[PDB]
Amino acid sequence: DRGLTSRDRRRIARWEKRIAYALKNG
RNA sequence: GCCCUGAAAAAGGGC
């Protein structure tokens, strides 16, 4: 079993999926 | 329960 859920792993991914937006949008 | 897509602090979708 894993202590992280579909939200954990994806939670950090946003770190690279959000920057592009929050960064490309100024 | 696990993800994927959404930027999402929506909305969605697959199994």
From Swiss-Prot:
Which protein are we looking at?
Transcription termination factor nun
Q: Which residues of the full protein are shown?
A: 22 to 47 of 112
